[PDB]
Amino acid sequence: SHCKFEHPRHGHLGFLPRKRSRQIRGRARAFPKDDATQKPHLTSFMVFKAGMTHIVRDVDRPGSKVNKKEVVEPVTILEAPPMVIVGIVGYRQTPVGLKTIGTVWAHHTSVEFRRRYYKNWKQSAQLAFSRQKQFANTKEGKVAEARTLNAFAKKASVIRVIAHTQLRKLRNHRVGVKKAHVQEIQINGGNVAAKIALAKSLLEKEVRVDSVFQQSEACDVCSVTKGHGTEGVVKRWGVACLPRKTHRGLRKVACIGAWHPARVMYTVARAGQHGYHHRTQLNKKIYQIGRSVAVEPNQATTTYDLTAKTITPMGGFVGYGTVRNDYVMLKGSVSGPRRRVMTLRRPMAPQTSRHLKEKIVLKFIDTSSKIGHGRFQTKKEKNQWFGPLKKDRIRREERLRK
Amino acid sequence: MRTIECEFSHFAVHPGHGRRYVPFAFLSTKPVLTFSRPKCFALYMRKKNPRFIPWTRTYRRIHRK
Amino acid sequence: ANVKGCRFRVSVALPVGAVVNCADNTGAKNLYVISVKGYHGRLNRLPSAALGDMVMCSVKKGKPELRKKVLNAVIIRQRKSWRRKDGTVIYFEDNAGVIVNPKGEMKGSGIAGPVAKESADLWPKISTHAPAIV
RNA sequence: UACGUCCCUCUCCAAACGAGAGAACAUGCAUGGGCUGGCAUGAGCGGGGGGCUCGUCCCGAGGCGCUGAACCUUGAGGCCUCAUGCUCAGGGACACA
RNA sequence: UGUCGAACGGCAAGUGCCCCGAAGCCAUCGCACGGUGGUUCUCGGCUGAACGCCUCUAAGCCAGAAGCCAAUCCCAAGACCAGAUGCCCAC
RNA sequence: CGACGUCGCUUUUUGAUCCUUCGAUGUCGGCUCUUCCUAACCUAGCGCCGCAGAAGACGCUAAGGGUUGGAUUGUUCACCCACUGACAGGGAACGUGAGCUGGGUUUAGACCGUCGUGAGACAGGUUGGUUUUACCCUACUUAGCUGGAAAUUGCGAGAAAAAGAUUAUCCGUAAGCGGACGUGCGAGCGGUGGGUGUACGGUACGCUCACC
RNA sequence: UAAUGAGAUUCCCUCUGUCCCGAGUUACUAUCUAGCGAAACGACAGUCAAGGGAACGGACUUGAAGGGCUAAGCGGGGAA
RNA sequence: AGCAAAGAUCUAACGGAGAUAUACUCAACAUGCAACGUUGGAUACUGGAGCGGGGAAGGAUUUCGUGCCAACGGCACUCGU
RNA sequence: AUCCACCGGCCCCGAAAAUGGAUGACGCU
RNA sequence: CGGGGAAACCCAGGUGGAGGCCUGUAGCGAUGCUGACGUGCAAAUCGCUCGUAUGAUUUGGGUAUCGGAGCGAAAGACUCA
Ligand SMILES: NC[C@@H]1O[C@H](O[C@H]2[C@@H](O)[C@H](O[C@@H]3[C@@H](O)[C@H](N)C[C@H](N)[C@H]3O[C@H]3O[C@H](CO)[C@@H](O)[C@H](O)[C@H]3N)O[C@@H]2CO)[C@H](N)[C@@H](O)[C@@H]1O
Ligand SMILES: [Mg+2]
Ligand SMILES: [Mg+2]
Ligand SMILES: [Mg+2]
Ligand SMILES: [Mg+2]
Ligand SMILES: [Mg+2]
Ligand SMILES: [Mg+2]
Ligand SMILES: [Mg+2]
């Protein structure tokens, strides 16, 4: 007999299996489509999540009820130290797939790059990339570098480079990892001879985030969801909770199937891992590509808001610290907790809708505290509400006593 | 935007922070009242004066200066 | 088919069963939300109203000239805090409605307190008789 | 034989247990300072309805002053290297008929 | 309210109760995002006979549905990957 | 649209049967949740009208997606109130009781009416009336470890591969053509050594050990 | 028929997580270890689609799957 | 599976076989853990309708000292009805 | 050389159901 | 004791402590959760809520009535699970 009333089923069935991610980092399963009429350019960049805040900006949207009026939008801060290129891979088309031809290396690799090869670096011989380093400038090894660079020019359709996050310029105390996060970034643009020349030129040289993205564009954010353990069916799938007088329990799915087919189906919601899942989340509009504090002591300062202040709030981002490097600022949320490495990748969606072409100018960036209720935008404003306090008048008493 | 100041405590209410409120006995000049905390709205509900509470700006401008 | 995709999303406040005030001087003192126009169905979910919504109502306390019948009211106040697009969260002391026609004319002459900007802009008869557009 | 991996130890983006991310003399951990927030003015001391005693001196809730004081602030795990402590040839097991 | 003689510091009442409360979790109770190509059905046609004219059909073509299949998205080599690589060993 | 006829499909009704179960298959409806089917209510394309427009009748391809909130009733059903783009019809042991609920049927108590001489009867009304067990196998959900292409062995040799496949340095294309350390002492491309500044802090670039 | 009722029913007020529509905290479990240590149950066992059949198969026919072994769940099957 | 009502134990010194238990080239942590009784001390509880002090019925040596730990006191025991 | 009425063979239409499915499977033209 | 009245008698303030009276301990029961448990603590218990609590009240010991019989404010209830 049919179900007596209709509701749409619970949970998208295309995000199955809802199992833990195989790896903690965001990894692109597909790059944008290669336009060979463009100029060669990188397509992804790894940033780390550093809390979130909100902004104020006026809206250019003709027809809308909020046209030329100021909105408050939440933004997420993603710290981006530059990544250093260490390799060049090239992939050739087969009827099986897309096979790797080989990789050249940079002749000089970082300590934190070849730390990724060790479960224990400090208690080790540390001699990785040590025979490749010395063979690469022999007579036969300078041949073998140019041997496989030519094999890219013959067989490869896809040229990628291998970068790593360069975590020692990320002077962060809470991201506790010291080995670098390694991914491959695909070159798109030009023919294969024009991709390798851009792959050779930025080799053993750091690439900075504002050379990959622009200020008022969008991107995809490949990132791994915040993990929540084993959760039941109400938290995980969002099923309705049963009436109060139910025996053995409320937070269950009552019927898990008919008598026939005499099996539980994959469509029936069950309990298990919730969170720590990979998500791609397209069309994340970017609002500000920031600049390091060694360059910019005044990061959150706008034309329309001349308060001299950085992007880091009062008392720091909660659980994270201070944004010490370049940063991107995206509209809204990205999947994952703070401190987690995330991949900003160029969009595969058509970036032609009038919401996505819109140029962004800000008017205010909230640099108030995220601990408690934020009240002051700078520490100069808290020293004008509060005058000299007691601990200041006895520090001024030690400074006169000397 | 602009920095509204709180009705009870005259704190700084920067954009996207407080919580505004408008009662049935509304003033013509202040129809909507901006509050910075629930603690500000709680002492407004039990009808406390902004002076005699030691952490508001009304107190600090009549007693301590 | 009249007012739904005209104003932004507002946190719904008044499900079916709610008993709101009559700020209109039609002799009535009371409304009772019977349903909401624009309710596309969801199983077990109630029709809930917000500021701009036209409701179906019935007076539960008022003049018996219009008491035991299905009327058309427009919400003008709600206690449920809604976030405006300029980032301000705002709410009223009371819920209220004002009885209208099927086309929107106010059927009375005056509103007790303020009305919101959300419900006045959708309804020009409500924006006219209102002493203060909050 | 070596490179190494794993346990024990430490951390928490992970977590029923395993697994995971990491670190393994490292501002790593510990305590302190400052910040940031929370509450709302600490013990102590000194100068008001009334009421005792022989103008004075005592009893008196409350109040005022020192005092946006005092306390709490990362810890299932806020911020800052801002200062100092602690480590003293890390230990076991495989890799290995 | 009881109780350490009183203040101090507290404690008992399975967290005494009341107000405010970080952090964490969380709400359509807040906030952000949710995209491409083809194939061909119905069908309307194009050339065009069988059938000296006519005819979308018999050969052959065109255009083309929220269907269908891919792209994107999620898991992924018991899909046994002479895919690529770092370092040791063994030939 | 279609009488009189007529040929049939359907198994969401009911009747008929008595095949299986009486050393037991938990016997209604809600609630929950997933899936299926098409005889399509809404949505995508359409044809056709006694189709001017607007609303709509009939039909085709299509089951991808959607298909509600309530009053009364234990109800399936029904019936009105109201919203909606629309509130389509069904299946899964009349889906779903170690999922629930127990209103209802379906005991022992009691009352009423009609029946009976009575004990009692009643597809008549009424009220009160224990809902037990998973720690096993599978399925499904997540979470670990770990071999194996003679799918454990045969030594049973197959590369989405190079081109001496007959001897042997590479580079770049087939005809061509670039150079390739020379003999324990030397040299060359090089990994690590000492002192006074350059590119986007510390890594690179200037000027003793292996290999040819 | 006043008074009385753990009696049966209906509406109204107050009231609220019964509900919309769920969330979050606590104690105790579960869970992990140390000590101790059962039972129910048990032909043999245990992946499915269709066909046939005592006319609802884990075993038969033809197809489709299936490397081994585990921990926590869970209530579709085992006409448990 | 479980041994989840009746809040709860902590500490030092003694007692005890029940430890402070290690093949080297090792300073200790990382290679003897857990658990017992008694007295002191701290912390609680019962809260006089008491885990207080005596009797009936019922039991009949469970009383008391001293030894003692095989089996019993569903964990433990050096303790014990 | 073109029409008209009839009759047969194969093929199509008539021909719509609830786990994914069956000339036994692949396939065969 | 006071007040009104021609009288019959009425009206007020105390006193008093009546009741198969009421709220509510113990006791005696067992309404609801159709709660917990349901190979339990238990072959009927636990929890909160509820009925009653000066009476046709609760209870000890002693006595008397039994098997087609006993006893029953009556449920075929009870007569050593
Ligand atoms: N034998 C002595 C008498 O007492 C009399 O005194 C009596 C009167 O003064 C007075 O009598 C009153 C009176 O006010 C009035 N006119 C009439 C009223 N009935 C009486 O009332 C008397 O009787 C009533 C009963 O009805 C009682 O309730 C009450 O105790 C009493 N006051 O109360 C006293 C009785 O207690 C006179 N002094 C007089 O006749 C004579 O002396
Ligand atoms: Mg976490
Ligand atoms: Mg009674
Ligand atoms: Mg236990
Ligand atoms: Mg006590
Ligand atoms: Mg024992
Ligand atoms: Mg009583
Ligand atoms: Mg009887």
A243 prior amide bond cis, ω within 30: no
Tokens 């179906």 locate to: C56
Strand E contact residues in chain A (17-76), C-beta within 7 Å: 17, 19, 21-22, 28-30, 73-74
How many other C-beta atoms can be found within 10 angstroms of the C-beta atom of residue C123?
21
Spanning CA of C47 to C1' of H45, the rounded length in angstroms is: 56
Looking at beta carbons, which residues of chain A come within 8 Å of C7? 65
CA proximity to A286, closest of A78, A16, A26? A78
Residue A126, phi then psi, degrees to nearest 5: 65, 25
Give the tokens for residue A268: 């029936």
Give the tokens for residue C111: 């509103």
Integer CA distances (angstroms), B12 to A388, B2, B9, B31, C122, in order: 19, 10, 9, 19, 33
CB of residue A245 closer than 7 A to nucleic acid strand J?
yes
- Closest CB from B11, B12, B16 relative to A54: B16
Q: Where are the beta strands (DSSP E) in B1-65?
A: 4-5, 12-13, 19-22, 33-35
* Separation between Cα atoms, residue B21 and residue A285, nearest integer Å: 33
Partner residues linked to A179 by β-bridges: none
Give the tokens for residue A163: 């970068």
Report, in ranges, which bases of strand E sit under 7 Å from a protein C-beta. Answer: 19-26, 28-36, 71-77, 79, 83-88
CB of residue C83 closer than 7 A to nucleic acid strand E?
yes
Instruction: Evaluate whether A44 touches A346 at the Cβ level (below 8 Å).
Output: yes
Cα C56 off chain centre by: 10
Q: Which nucleotide is nearest to A12 (CA to C1')?
A: E74
Give the tokens for residue A227: 């993990």
Three-state secondary structure string covering B49-64: CCCCCCCCHHHHCCCC
* Separation between Cα atoms, residue A124 and residue A126, nearest integer Å: 5
Q: Which H or E run contains A279?
A: strand A278-279
How many other C-beta atoms can be found within 10 angstroms of the C-beta atom of residue B7?
21
Integer CA distances (angstroms), A68 to A59, A93, A302, in order: 5, 51, 18
Partner residues linked to A231 by β-bridges: A272
* Separation between Cα atoms, residue C52 and residue C123, nearest integer Å: 8
* Separation between Cα atoms, residue B35 and residue B6, nearest integer Å: 5
Q: Which long-range contacts (CB under 8 A, 24 or more apart) does A171-177 make?
A: A171/A324, A172/A48, A172/A79, A172/A320, A172/A321, A172/A324, A172/A339, A173/A321, A174/A319, A174/A320, A174/A321, A174/A339, A175/A48, A175/A339
C74: distance to nearest CA of chain A, Å? 21
* Separation between Cα atoms, residue A338 and residue A319, nearest integer Å: 8
DSSP A184-244: EEE-BSS-HHHHHHHHHHTSSSEE-GGGT--TT-EEEEEEEPPP--EE-HHHHT-PPPPPT
Yes or no, beta carbons of B15 and A374 under 8 Å apart: no
DSSP C83-122: E-TTS-EEEESS-EEEEE-SS---SSS-BSS-B-HHHHHH
The string over C40-50, giving b where at least 16 C-beta atoms fall within 10 Å of a residue's C-beta and e elsewhere, is eeeeeebbbbb
Spanning CA of A373 to C1' of E58, the rounded length in angstroms is: 82
Integer CA distances (angstroms), C18 to C15, C34, C37, C90, in order: 6, 8, 15, 21
Report, in ranges, which bases of strand I sit under 7 Å from a protein C-beta. Answer: 19
* Separation between Cα atoms, residue A336 and residue A318, nearest integer Å: 15
DSSP A289-345: E---TTT-S-SS-BTTB-----SS-TT-BTTTB---S-EEEEES--SS-TT-EEEEE
Instruction: Evaluate whether C20 touches C97 at the Cβ level (below 8 Å).
Output: yes
DSSP A44-104: EEEEEEEEEEEEEEE---TTSTTTT-EEEEEEEEEE-PPEEEEEEEEEEE-SS-EEEEEEE
Geometric angle at alpha carbon A268, from A23 and A279, rounded to 5°: 25
Give the tokens for residue A319: 């659980």
* Separation between Cα atoms, residue C52 and residue C59, nearest integer Å: 20
Q: Which H or E run contains A396?
A: helix A390-401
Instruction: Evaluate whether C118 touches C93 at the Cβ level (below 8 Å).
Output: no
Q: What is the DSSP letter of C47?
A: P
Answer left, alpha or beta for residue C114, where phi above 0 means left and psi between -120 and 50 means alpha: beta
* Separation between Cα atoms, residue A43 and residue A30, nearest integer Å: 11
Instruction: Evaluate whether C29 touches C61 at the Cβ level (below 8 Å).
Output: yes
CA proximity to C29, closest of C84, C86, C94, C93? C94
Q: Residue A275 C-alpha to ligand 1 middle, in angstroms?
A: 98
Give the tokens for residue A223: 């990132």
CA proximity to A185, closest of A286, A279, A283, A82? A82
B58: distance to nearest CA of chain C, Å? 24
* Separation between Cα atoms, residue A264 and residue A277, nearest integer Å: 24
Q: Which H or E run contains C49?
A: strand C48-49
Helix (H, G, I), strand (E, B) or coil at A266: coil
Q: What is the DSSP letter of C24?
A: B
Instruction: Evaluate whether A178 touches A167 at the Cβ level (below 8 Å).
Output: yes
How many other C-beta atoms can be found within 10 angstroms of the C-beta atom of residue A87?
21
Contacts of B11 by beta carbon, 8 Å cutoff, 6+ apart: A375, B5, B36, B37, B40, B57
Instruction: Evaluate whether A157 touches A93 at the Cβ level (below 8 Å).
Output: yes
Partner residues linked to A284 by β-bridges: A219
Looking at beta carbons, which residues of chain B come within 8 Å of C134? 22, 26, 31-32
PDB resolution in Å: 2.5
* Separation between Cα atoms, residue C32 and residue C55, nearest integer Å: 9
Answer left, alpha or beta for residue C119, where phi above 0 means left and psi between -120 and 50 means alpha: alpha
Looking at beta carbons, which residues of chain C come within 8 Å of B16? 87-88
Residue A153 sits at the chain C interface (C-beta within 8 Å):
no
Contacts of B3 by beta carbon, 8 Å cutoff, 6+ apart: B12, B13, B14, B15
CA dihedral defined by C96, C99, C105, C109, rounded to 10 degrees?
Answer: -80
Geometric angle at alpha carbon A198, from A196 and A200, rounded to 5°: 65
- Closest CB from C42, C44, C85 relative to A66: C85
Give the tokens for residue B37: 């905390």
Tokens 């700078």 locate to: A378
How many other C-beta atoms can be found within 10 angstroms of the C-beta atom of residue C76?
29
* Separation between Cα atoms, residue A300 and residue A288, nearest integer Å: 10
